[PDB]
Amino acid sequence: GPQDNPYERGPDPTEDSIEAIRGPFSVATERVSSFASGFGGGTIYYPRETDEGTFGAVAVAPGFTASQGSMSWYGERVASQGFIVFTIDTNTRLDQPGQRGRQLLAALDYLVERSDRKVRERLDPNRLAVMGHAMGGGGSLEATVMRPSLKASIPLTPWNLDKTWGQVQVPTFIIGAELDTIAPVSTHAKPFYESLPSSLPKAYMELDGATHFAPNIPNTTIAKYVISWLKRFVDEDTRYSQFLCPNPTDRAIEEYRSTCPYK
Ligand SMILES: CCOC(=O)CCC(=O)O
Numbered sequence: 001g002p003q004d005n006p007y008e009r010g011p012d013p014t015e016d017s018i019e020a021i022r023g024p025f026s027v028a029t030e031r032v033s034s035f036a037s038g039f040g041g042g043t044i045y046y047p048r049e050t051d052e053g054t055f056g057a058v059a060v061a062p063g064f065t066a067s068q069g070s071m072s073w074y075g076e077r078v079a080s081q082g083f084i085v086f087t088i089d090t091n092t093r094l095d096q097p098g099q100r101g102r103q104l105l106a107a108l109d110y111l112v113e114r115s116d117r118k119v120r121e122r123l124d125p126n127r128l129a130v131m132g133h134a135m136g137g138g139g140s141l142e143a144t145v146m147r148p149s150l151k152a153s154i155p156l157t158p159w160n161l162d163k164t165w166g167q168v169q170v171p172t173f174i175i176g177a178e179l180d181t182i183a184p185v186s187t188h189a190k191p192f193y194e195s196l197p198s199s200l201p202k203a204y205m206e207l208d209g210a211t212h213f214a215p216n217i218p219n220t221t222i223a224k225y226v227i228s229w230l231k232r233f234v235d236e237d238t239r240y241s242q243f244l245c246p247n248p249t250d251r252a253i254e255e256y257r258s259t260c261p262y263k
C-alpha cells in the first residue's frame with residue numbers, strides 16, 4: 001500500500017497484470033525533434049493520470065544495424081504501467097556503445113530539464129532508468145557506469161566489446177536471445193551478466209528459440225519482466241518481487257540467473 005511506499009502506482013499486481021498489453025494508466029505521447037544537438041529526437045510516452053503521484057522514467061535506445069523493426073512497442077506497454085518512457089530514434093552516426101550511452105543520458109537530461117511541461121509535471125527526476133537493444137543495450141551498460149545514480153538498467157540482447165562490468169552499481173536485468181548471431185549470448189550477454197557484481201541486484205533471462213530481433217516485436221515474456229524490474233527498482237515496489245524471486249520459469253525462458261533475494 002501507499003503508506004509503506006509513496007512510489008507505489010496502480011493496483012496490486014498479478015501474473016495477468018504484468019502480462020497485460022496495457023496497464024491501468026492511459027498514455028499520451030509527445031514527439032521530440034531533438035533532445036540534444038547531434039543526438040536527434042524521440043517519442044515520450046507518459047501516463048495521463050496524475051492523481052496517484054509522479055512517475056519514474058526510462059530512456060530506451062535502439063540498436064545500430066538496419067531494421068525497420070523498432071522500440072516503439074515499449075512506449076505504451078511500459079508507460080501504461082505507470083512510467084514515463086522516452087524512445088530514442090535510430091541514429092546511424094552513433095556506431096559505438098559509449099556514444100549510445102551518452103545518447104541515453106542526454107535523453108534523460110532533456111526529460112528532466114526541458115521536456116514539455118505536461119511531462120515534467122508528471123516526472124520524478126530522482127528516479128530514472130535506461131534500457132536498450134543491441135548496441136543500445138551495450139549503451140545501457142555504459143550509461144550506468146557514467147551515471148551510477150540510475151535506478152535500473154535493462155540491456156536487451158546487448159552488444160558491447162567491453163566485457164567487464166564489475167563497476168556497475170545500478171540494478172541490471174539482461175535479456176539474451178538463444179539464437180542470436182549478431183550479439184551472441186556466449187560472448188556478450190552472459191559475460192556481461194557474470195562480470196556484474198555478485199552483490200548487485202541482477203538477473204539474466206535468456207529467450208528460447210529467439211533471434212537478435214526478438215526485442216523489436218511485442219513479446220509478453222520480455223514485457224512482463226521488464227515491467228516487474230522497473231517496478232521493483234525505479235519504484236522500490238516490493239509488490240513486484242513476487243515475479244522476480246524465485247526465478248521466472250516461463251516456457252519461453254531458456255535460462256534464468258539471478259542474485260535473488262533482492263534485499
Ligand atoms: C541491432 C544489431 O546492431 C547492433 O546494435 C549490434 C551489432 C552491431 O553493432 O553490428
Ligand SMILES: [Zn+2]
Binds near residue numbers: 001003005
Ligand atoms: Zn505498499
Ligand SMILES: [Zn+2]
Binds near residue numbers: 163164166
Ligand atoms: Zn569494462
Ligand SMILES: [Zn+2]
Binds near residue numbers: 178207209254
Ligand atoms: Zn532453447
Ligand SMILES: [Zn+2]
Binds near residue numbers: 015243
Ligand atoms: Zn509467475
